[PDB]
Design a protein around this ligand. Structure first.
Ligand SMILES: [Cl-]
Ligand SMILES: [Cl-]
Ligand SMILES: [Cl-]
Ligand SMILES: [Cl-]
Ligand SMILES: [Cl-]
Ligand SMILES: [Cl-]
Ligand SMILES: [Cl-]
Ligand SMILES: [Cl-]
Ligand SMILES: [Cl-]
Ligand SMILES: [Mg+2]
Ligand SMILES: [Mg+2]
Ligand SMILES: [Mg+2]
Ligand SMILES: [Mg+2]
Ligand SMILES: [Mg+2]
Ligand SMILES: [Mg+2]
Lengths: 517, 517, 517
């Protein structure tokens, strides 16, 4: 492809194509290529004869003349978290997946689904089923929630992104039956819901996986246009170029973008709402959209600069867009959702911002840019101002903002910062439902003193100690106090080092939060 | 002093000696060297004539023929946080201290007291008074709490540690009258209580300020002996030497101590309880007591190693001892409090632990010491085991454990880690009452995977990302699960960079927590 | 254990205890817990019907009614290197292990054995068998060599060192039958030989795994004494203390050892020979025996200093001792083998060598120690002189000498340096037979110019560029030119980062080299 740096052309998308149903079929009767059973440590208990006490495992073992309990014992499988046994026999394949002794909802069922997907891929299975060894004392509603979390683990666990690999094998998984957790309209509705969330998660992973010569600011804006065109009855789009953002006086955003003359910036505005008449709560989801971040003149240097992973500095924007993709299918009433991303890349050239430059955001405040590698908060300053100007009641921003948050919270837990206690409670509860990991961090106001400039209204970059907190405090200067606002620093969990791949972190939590408004 | 490295002899202690009373005297009638008035922004409102509307300021200004409102206006004092006006006139001196627009209890009143102390010191005042410009709509109980917080700010703000300075001036402040907040037994009882807490805070600051050639492990154990001897009806002491700790199989502690052959280690055990018969809840306060930390063979190197401040690595122990000093005066019933510090210094010699050495804690678990600069958690392993073995129901440990927590939370906010939600609530509430800043951080269990060893039961040092969390998870391996336990990483707030001095952080929170049991 | 730093006591040794035989039993007839089959890509070819063409796999699949070829296809096993299929069925367990398309002897058969051991451990197997899918066109001698290499992979792959873990599971593997490769005296003799080499490899791994608070110079000398006592008819021992090494004028060795006053140095001399009368070629094996290396005053600092792995700086000594252990069982005629290790630890204290100190080796040459972290070559200087003084014809030294060699050759390939072309050929051929990876590097003489001192005969540490080569050139100053000598820099392969464990690298190559003299 001749306009792309390095002539790289992506292959066709690998988004999963799986037909999912909830069935009542007795597990012993089910037919297909693979049955995955989620078993807790208690589920694995054995009697005086070393036989399974769990009625389902007892029955399956009995059909296999003891082969299942023999193999489990030899392999020391006792239902612990992370354990699995895989048995191929005449007629099919069974895998037991350990759930541990404190099975948490929905993450345990996500992991059951992921394990079922990994075992499907390693035997090239096409049609699989998943059941729990026990559903005793789970309510009808808990079983429905466990069903849709299993479906999520299977769909997302099946996804392998092979767009940039010259040779690879397509996924073979075609269907999933979820057994023993309920049938009929309500469970099917909840599974459908999970599938819509998964399509947004997968779009998120694809946008972040793709390198920055493929996903440029223009391409990110085209991706937002494609979402609006797909759901054009409920989502509209406005893309602003650099000239329009200049008329809107977005000096902090345009200053970050100034160096990157080859891949011009675009400011993305999507708006979801159903065309009905009821009152709508107005919400904004703002995502940091640095399609690449070199650091600018404050170039990222050192052996763990991670400069080579900075295509993932649009990870917040990928979550906002994935949330739009999910909500276009789900079509909730009662909400109007603005999805806003100031997309650009942070490069080095003769046109670029210098360290020490003073830039003026669209609310008139001046910022001394003492480090050009703290550029995401400058693009967010203008995005947050624009979001407030659309008349929204509540805003969540997601940004890969600081290394400091990963020091604080490790790679897997995002830090949530907000002046507004009710909004914190809403987001914590949304994350409890989605299974995603986040943690409220304090907006310690006394650290604002370190952000003073000798020349402008403020600097952009505080000391390393407390760096995620002064990031949050900086963003607060650009948010109208009448709007509830929470900032989620997702530098860690947007990317998995162990998988070397994007996670699509944030999409499911944002969708839950919208639906709970 | 001939046995001290560098021949250094401390001067006499500068602990404040202030007589404090609560009085009803009309502020305009009060006589002495300095009156400090706490004023909020609202308290500073002026009428059509530019005169104060607040009845107290109106009256004082009227006696000064307008000099007070003239000076306030010229100096642009309007009651904002951090502002003050100082006026000397025939008959006395007044200072107005800004309290801002959201005066929080008790920190605002701490700051009022601190400001009154700073203004006393700069005019060599001996007898001062503090009042609020307004007490409207404060309950009798809130006024008592504001009185004792003012007394705290004055006492602690007056303290200047001049033990190691060859020439310096003694503090001149002799008395404080707190006006308009109530009189009689209940307010006097609460002020007395604050004074007891202050004596513990000040002992804490002195222990941490003193350099490591003065406060050695032996000297720290002598300081604990002096507390027990002072309060010998309610506090007993047992000091264990290296040989006794070896009989108790404290291999992780003794390994850290092994290099420091010149200043041998001592394990400090104090126990507070009143000699009465009621049931006592059994609690332990465990403090990290590294009287110096070079890093050992993993020497602290680099321009911000802070090696030159590592006398403050016994900051957790200083809080535990200060809490003992306070509780010996307060004598609460219903509690038995164990104060435990495994004191040592972490040095380099031929006898020292090498990186990669495997050490065995007293519960039998083996630790591969992949970094000898993560030595505090090894001494704490054995201290926590000992605390559990005394039969306590709840434990709090305080330790200057990680640089990672200061990255997360800045210099002023400690991170609290606990498996036990009720204990977290107790400590959060204790800190709300004490005014100290702390914040719960999560014990993310998935990070325990990074702590695996190829040879021992675990390593001592995880990756930088999530380092405060894996510190917490490591300590958890040494705590009996039946005991509620919370770990407070106080690396930041035990030391003030701006003041170049110790804070005695932790003492007041621990005392509140004990009294709320 | 009260004299050990950290009170650590090793558990009982986990050296494998496996009974190994070579059998003619048809593979389909064999009975036990696990059969492992080594299959090349060609061995996996299928016919028009998708059935195995290989007669053995065809037969096994036919007994399993197609279950083996079904499972292989689903799992995409086609005999590639690193692939395996594991099938549990009524009556037993089979694993197919991919050997690839260019199966090299003996490493391929090592890997087959290792894979069989890993599959034994994961099903707790006690009695296993290994066969090749095809032995067509392998000579009787190649099949014997493949048998003993399989036995090696099984024995070494089974070994798990749990001496320092407080809870762990003992290995269950008890017996190995090697099928279809021959029976009778010659194959049994070759398997026995491999077992003797394995016992030396395992002693090597144990000595290196053990941390430096457990394996001190004294303990290493006791380990050498135990070897001599075990084989006292053919191996004698002389251990020299610091005072005796001083009489021998070993100033470079004693200078390195000077700081470590707590763990004194011992110079280990073993001598193997059978008590018969024929002429013996006299050989020496010299191993660098730094039981720990801090760097000394040139302390190892930086995030990848690897200071925490420096217990493995006695990896060369571990190979020399393991070779002694093997040769004590093998008892070759015609050779007299001196095994020499100048054991010490490189610490920091008031007694230690300073950078810039001039030390005098026992041949009278003076060395300016411009970096105390290049200390291994100073201990080797005196060890090499002593080896020459015993009248040997050829010397090999093994040392973990330089980071530079790992830069050059990666973690898995040792660099061999020698003035003597015939000795290089001997060692290359010995390594071809043992399967170990090494590569001749040049002794570029022009770089000796960088080793000049302004004050002594030479410095010890050249520039980083060419650092492994100037290491070799330095050692050459201490070797009599009449003695053939080769230096093997094994800094990389003595330790596996992926396994977090010692490899015992060097033992099998040294044993082959001795037997080929
Ligand atoms: Cl079948
Ligand atoms: Cl694309
Ligand atoms: Cl509004
Ligand atoms: Cl006067
Ligand atoms: Cl003192
Ligand atoms: Cl208890
Ligand atoms: Cl069987
Ligand atoms: Cl040993
Ligand atoms: Cl000779
Ligand atoms: Mg940046
Ligand atoms: Mg960025
Ligand atoms: Mg330390
Ligand atoms: Mg420390
Ligand atoms: Mg060295
Ligand atoms: Mg060395």
């Amino acid at each position: 492809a001749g306009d792309t740096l390095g002539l790289t052309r992506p292959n066709e998308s690998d988004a999963p194509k799986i037909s999912i149903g909830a069935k009542d079929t007795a597990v012993v009767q089910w037919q297909g290529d693979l049955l995955a059973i989620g078993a807790t440590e208690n589920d694995m208990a054995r009697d005086e004869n070393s036989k399974f006490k769990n009625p389902l495992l007892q029955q399956l073992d009995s059909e296999l003349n003891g082969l299942l309990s023999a193999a489990s014992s030899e392999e020391d499988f006792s239902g612990k978290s992370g354990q699995s046994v895989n048995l191929r026999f005449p007629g099919g394949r069974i895998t037991l997946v350990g759930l541990g002794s404190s099975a948490s909802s929905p993450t345990s069922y996500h992991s059951l689904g992921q394990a079922a997907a990994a075992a499907a891929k390693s035997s090239q299975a096409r049609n699989i089923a998943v059941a729990l060894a026990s559903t005793d004392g789970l309510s009808a509603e808990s079983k429905i929630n466990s069903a849709s979390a299993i479906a999520t683990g299977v769909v997302l666990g099946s996804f392998e992104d092979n767009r940039f690999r010259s040779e690879s094998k397509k996924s073979t998984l075609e269907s999933l039956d979820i057994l023993g957790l309920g049938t009929g309209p309500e469970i099917e509705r909840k599974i459908k819901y999970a599938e819509h969330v998964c399509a947004g998660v997968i779009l998120g992973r694809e946008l972040v996986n793709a390198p920055a010569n493929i996903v440029t600011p223009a391409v990110l804006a085209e991706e937002a246009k494609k979402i609006a065109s797909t759901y054009s009855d409920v989502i509209s789009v406005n893309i602003l170029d650099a000239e329009q953002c200049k008329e809107l006086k977005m000096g902090a955003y345009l200053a970050v973008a100034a160096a990157a003359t080859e891949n011009p910036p675009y400011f993305i505005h999507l708006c979801f709402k159903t065309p009905t008449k009821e009152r709508k709560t107005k919400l904004a989801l703002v995502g940091k959209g640095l399609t690449f971040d070199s650091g600018g003149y404050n170039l990222k240097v050192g052996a763990r600069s991670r400069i080579e992973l900075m295509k993932n500095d649009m990870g917040g924007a990928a979550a906002v867009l994935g949330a739009a993709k999910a909500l276009g299918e789900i079509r909730p009433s009662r909400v109007e959702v603005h999805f806003i991303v100031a997309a650009c890349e942070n490069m080095i050239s003769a046109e670029g911002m210098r360290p020490g430059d003073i830039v003026t955001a669209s609310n008139g405040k001046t910022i001394e840019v003492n480090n050009t590698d703290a550029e995401g908060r400058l693009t967010l300053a203008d995005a947050l101002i624009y979001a407030c100007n659309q008349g929204v009641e509540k805003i969540i921003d997601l940004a890969t903002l600081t290394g400091a948050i990963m020091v604080a919270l490790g790679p897997s837990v995002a830090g949530a910062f907000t002046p507004n206690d009710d909004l914190a409670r809403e987001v914590v509860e949304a994350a409890e439902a989605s299974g995603e990991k986040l943690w409220r961090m304090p907006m310690e106001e006394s650290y604002w003193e370190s952000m003073k400039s000798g020349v402008a209204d403020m600097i952009n970059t505080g000391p390393g100690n407390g760096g995620a907190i002064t990031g949050a405090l900086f963003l607060k200067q650009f948010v109208d106090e009448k709007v509830q606002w929470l900032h989620l620093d997702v530098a860690g969990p947007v990317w998995s080092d162990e998988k070397k791949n994007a996670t699509g972190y944030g999409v499911s939590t944002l969708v839950e939060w919208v639906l709970r408004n």
